[PDB]
Structures are given as C-alpha cells and as structure tokens.
Paper text:
The Fas-activated serine/threonine kinase (FASTK) family of RBPs has been shown to regulate and fine-tune discrete aspects of mitochondrial gene expression. Members of the FASTK families share the RNA-binding domains [name], [name] and [name], the latter of which is known for its nuclear and chloroplast nuclease activity for RNA splicing and processing. Here we show that [name], as well as having a role in non-canonical RNA processing, is required for the stability of the MT-[name] [name] through its association with the LRPPRC:SLIRP complex at the 3′ end to protect its polyadenylated tail from degradation.
The atomic structure of [name] from residues 309–631, that includes the two FAST and [name] domains, was determined at 2.15 Å resolution. The [name] domain separates the [name] domain from the [name] domain, creating a positively charged cavity that could potentially bind negatively charged RNA. The distance between D523 and N570 in [name] is slightly extended compared to D51 and H69 in Vsr, however, the equivalent of H69 in I-Bth0305I has been shown to adopt a different conformation and active site metal co-ordination is known to be reconfigured upon substrate binding in Vsr. Another apparent structural feature is the central helix (Q445-E464), that we have referred to as a ‘Lock’, flanked by two unidentified loops without sufficient electron density. The full-length protein could not be produced effectively as it resulted in aggregation and based on our structure, we speculate that it may be possible for the ‘Lock’ helix to be displaced by insertion of the ‘Key’ helix (E610-L632) to promote tandem oligomerization. We mutated the cavity site residue D523 to alanine and found that this mutation did not affect the stability of the protein, and it did not affect the processing of MT-ND5 nor the stability of MT-[name] mRNAs, indicating that [name] may have lost its endonuclease activity and has been repurposed as an adapter protein for regulating the stability and maturation of specific mitochondrial transcripts. We conclude that L463 and residues 616–618 are required for the stability of [name], whereas the positively charged residues 620, 622 and 623, and therefore the Key helix interactions, are important for its activity.
Author numbering: -58 to 479, 488 to 633
The structure:
Amino acid sequence: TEEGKLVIWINGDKGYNGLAEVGKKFEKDTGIKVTVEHPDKLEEKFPQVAATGDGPDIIFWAHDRFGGYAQSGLLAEITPDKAFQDKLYPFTWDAVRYNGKLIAYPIAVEALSLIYNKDLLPNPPKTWEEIPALDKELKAKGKSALMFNLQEPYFTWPLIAADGGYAFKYENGKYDIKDVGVDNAGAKAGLTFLVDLIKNKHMNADTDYSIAEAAFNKGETAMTINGPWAWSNIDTSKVNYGVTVLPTFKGQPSKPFVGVLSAGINAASPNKELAKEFLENYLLTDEGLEAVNKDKPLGAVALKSYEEELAKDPRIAATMENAQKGEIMPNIPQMSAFWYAVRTAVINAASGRQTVDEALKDAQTGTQTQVSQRLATDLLSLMPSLTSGEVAHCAKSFALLKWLSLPLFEAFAQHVLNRAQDITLPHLCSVLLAFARLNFHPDQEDQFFSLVHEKLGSELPGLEPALQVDLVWALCVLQQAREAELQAVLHPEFHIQFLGGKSQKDQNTFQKLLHINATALLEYPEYSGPLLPASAVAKVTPLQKELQETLKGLLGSADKGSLEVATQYGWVLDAEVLLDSDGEFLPVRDFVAPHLAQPTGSQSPPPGSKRLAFLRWEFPNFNSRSKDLLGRFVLARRHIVAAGFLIVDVPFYEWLELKSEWQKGAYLKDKMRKAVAEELAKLE
Ligand SMILES: OC[C@H]1O[C@](O)(CO)[C@@H](O)[C@@H]1O
Ligand SMILES: OC[C@H]1O[C@](O)(CO)[C@@H](O)[C@@H]1O
C-alpha cells in the first residue's frame, strides 16, 4: 500500500527467504525494492487492514480463503493474457476464480495420496474393492491393510465422492450453491463401502490422524491416506514407503480435495502492475519457483514447465495426479456448513447412529439450507424488524428441521406478545404449532398461551376441521389445552367426519384426535365433556427388531409379554409385561388391560403387580443434536405413564453401546428392575 515498492505477506512455514531472493532479482532489474513479511495469523489480519485500505501489495495463502476476500472486494482482478494462462495447468485457474473473474495466481498444488509400505505391500492396490481381502491376508501376519483418519471429512471424502459425489457443482467458472452432491448415489455407495470396511473389522471407527500416523510410521499397517505435510515424519521412521494414486472405486478415481497455494493482489495497492510483473515474469518462472522451492518445498506446482522437473520425485507426481483427478475445494462461504454437516454424517453412519442414507440425507439438508449457529444468530438480530409472517415462516422452518434454538424461539414468543394487538391467527398458530413440534415452553408461558386461548376461543369453530385438530393437539402436547377447546373437537360431530376416511390425511387427523381424547381421559380429571365412543378407538427398524428378539429371549414364553401393543390412545408399545410383586413375569394377556380397545382377559392383576411398557426412541424422534424428544413423543410418553405404566425407555444411543446379545439382555433386565425401584421410592 505504498507506491514504488512491493510488500508481500506469506505464511511462516513457506520459503519466504527464497521468495525474498526473487524480490532481490526483481529490484536488480527494475529498481523496485521487494520486502517479504510473514506476520502471524496473516490470514486473519489481512481482511482487517485491507478493509480500510492497508496491508501488503501481494498476499500468499491457500485459495479457499481468497473466495471470501474477493466477496469483500479486497482482491484485485488480475489480467494475465491467454499466453500466460497456458503456462499453468488449466484446472488450477478454476481455483482462483470468483464470480467468473480471476482474483489470484495459482502457485502450488496439494492433495492427498495413497501412502504404502513397500515391505508389507510391494504393489499397492489399484482399487478400493481389493482392500478387504488384503486386510484378511495381513491380519493373519499381525498387520492391517489400511488406516487413515476417519474423523474429519477431508480424509474420507476421496472415497465418498469417487463415484459421483461433490460439495457444490462447478460450471462455467461459478459454483451453484443450490446444487449439492452430498446425497446422490455416488456419495451413498462410497460411504456405504467405508462403513462396511468398519463393520467387517477392516477399519476402526475411532481411528483419527494421530492413530493412523503412528500405526503406519511404526510399520503396523500397510497403507494410509495423507498429504505432503506428513512425509517428513515417515522419512524419520524405518518404513520404506511409496506415494501413489489413490485407489479407484467402481472404476472411478478417488476425488480428494485440492488446495491451491495462490498469490492475490491487494485491491488497495497502488502497484498492481508492479505486482503483476513480479508475479508473472519473475515468480511464476522456473527460476523463481526453484528459488522458493530450495528454501521450503512447494510440493507440486501449477507451472507446467517446473512441475516436470519436480515430478521426477514420484511422490510429487502422485500428488499432482491425485489433484488432477480430485475436486478443487470450493472457495465459497457456504463450505462452512458443508464441513459440519458431512462430518456429523460420516461419524453417525460409521458408528451406527444413522444409516448411510439417513446420514447423507441430513447432510444434504444441512448443506443446502446452511443451518448453523450463525444462522440462528443472524435471525435473532433481525427479530425486531421481522414481520409476524416472517416469524411464523421462521418458526415453521426451524421446527421442520427439528432445530430448537432456545434463544430464537424465546424471541419468537416475545415477538408474538409485542404484536398481540394486530397479529393474525395464522401467524400466531404457526408459532404454536412450531412450539408443540419441538416441545418448546417460553418463559412468559402464561402470557403466550393466554393470547393463544384468547385469539382461538372465538374463531376455533369456524376453522377447517383438520386444522382445529392440529391446533388443539398442539395445546395438548404443551399441556395447555382447555376444556372448552377439547370439547370443541371432542363433541360427537367431529368424529364421524374424520372417522370415515381412507385419505391417510384424515387418518392422521384422526390419530391426533385419539391423542386429544386420550389427553381428556388421562390428564383432565374434572373433565366432564364429550369423549370419543369406545367403539372408535380400535416397516420395521433394526432397533425395533433387535429389541424384540432380545425381549423374546428374556421372556422365554410368548405368554409372558405382548409385543407391538396398540393402545386405545393411538400409541403403540414396543412391548408390555406384567410383573408380580416378586419381579417375575405374569401371563399378561390373562388379565384386564384398560389401556387397550379390546378386553383381552378377565382376571384382575395381583396386588403389587407392576405393568411395564418398553418404549423405543429412534434417532429422528429427538430434536437435532439433543436427547430431548419431539413433542409428539413427549405426549406419547406422558400418556403411557398416565395410563398406569412404568416406563422402560430404550433410546437408540443407549442400545448402540450394547455390542453383544448378553449386554442387551442385561441392560433390559436392569432397566426393568430400576423402573420398579424408582416407583417404590415414589410411594414414600
Ligand atoms: O489442506 C488444508 C486442510 O487440511 C486439513 O488439515 C485437513 O484436516 C484442514 O484442516 C485444512 O483446511
Ligand atoms: O427427552 C426426555 C426424555 O428422554 C428420555 O430419557 C428418553 O429415554 C425419557 O426417559 C425422557 O422422558
């Protein structure tokens, strides 16, 4: 930012001294002094001081940061002619583009490769499909085939994306933030193969960077996946290692992300043509790059002529080959959500918290919709200027993603109260329905639901019938329904309406009617209003499957428990048992069962009998990243308890820690005992 000289920022781990030698030759020929600095955290200092017109004339950094600098207008558009652009590998120019315009010069290229132990594995595998058999071979020799960091998506992405996956679609020099390839058939096939490697004991789901590096550099595993930064540590080991092309999957190359060390020009620089001359004519030449490479190695470089020299090192050649088959890392701000969404998906799928399809689906959603704490924070700040309809829209969308940001939902409630004067019923109802879906109770709880009752009392009968059900049901979820609202939906007219339907929509409306009716029966003791007539109350997951098989083994006989028990309240129990006072199973269906629509037995349960319900909770039954159930299932559990059941909760994350059948039986028996003991303590 000073005329007549050039100031260059570059990270401290690069060959800034070799870069200075280029500056000295530049001064010698042009008379322009060139100064090179390596300030700490320059990738964060640069947007600070360039926003106000200060900083260096040229900055060196990985290309992904430059996309954000350009958005702020901090990087000048560069003007290399086609003659110069032909000197560099074409794909590298695709990394220094913003809104179709070049904003930096490619310098060096970096990507993951396959690193292998030539003593354990003289010829590395060409394909991913061979590795399992190879691991069986090596496990018998006291070794393993492959170990790499499974915790961070940067290392797993080469396999996930091999057969068609991609972060954001790139076309005509631009990224399409709406076109996300996290959940297509290629991403699924790759992740499935990764998960299968784990299930088959060829890889461990806990393996991270440190574990894999130690294993390979100690000679314990025949292969790893890593980058040039890791070569020094292997040189200091005793492993005769090679570096080569990543294996194919479905005959498609592995697609690692590519990092392009680039040089940008400060938009606030008065020496843009001097910076252009130094970069194009002195740095990006065989002599210039050699000078920098002599100080600290660049790895593979974008300049074709010098890459031919460096590529004599077969490790550099493999780096460039993998980069040319890889996916340039998108330089757009939308990648932040990608990293978080995909990281969660891989961990969830590899550990069994989700299937491959479920995990990638959510990562897709998370990447397309850019959900992040910054999103909720941005909305929280707009709240005073948002309309009632915009809040209703917000609430609906967050509830749909099961994303319960307590600070934002409390601001929804306050927003509604501050506009109780003119807020329309639809806008109020959208918030109510969102609160119920996520089981959110605001701090000004009495005030919020007083408004709901007030606004809804006079207009409820005139609403569409299915909507009346949706709204009363939401109040039942939140324990706010009033007898007059229950009555409005439970009087003998409303039923015949939805009762006789095949739509699956009337059937859902009716199911919610059973929940309302169940609330009146079980949670309002003084309720003397109308109820549904007794005559009108009459796909399998792995968790559901294993829970049933484990329970069948414990019970021993079919008569000591009932599986998939449909109640007259709409809810279905995974299982029910009747324990006598000694904790031994009784023949449950020999006894009366008020919770059921049909009577199934005449005998009265012995005194001291304890009726237990096993209730399974699946991953989607919870708010995102929490152990709090959605409203629908808070309501279900509240009803089963009110029906006189002791609860054995079987959430997926508890069952997931039980790796053997013995553990699963022991866990269920413990939960039964604990529930019964919890009760006896209640009665004191
Ligand atoms: O290539 C640069 C990238 O490499 C990583 O270390 C991989 O974990 C990232 O943290 C960084 O952004
Ligand atoms: O979200 C709260 C709910 O979470 C559970 O622990 C899940 O098993 C229930 O016991 C509890 O009521």
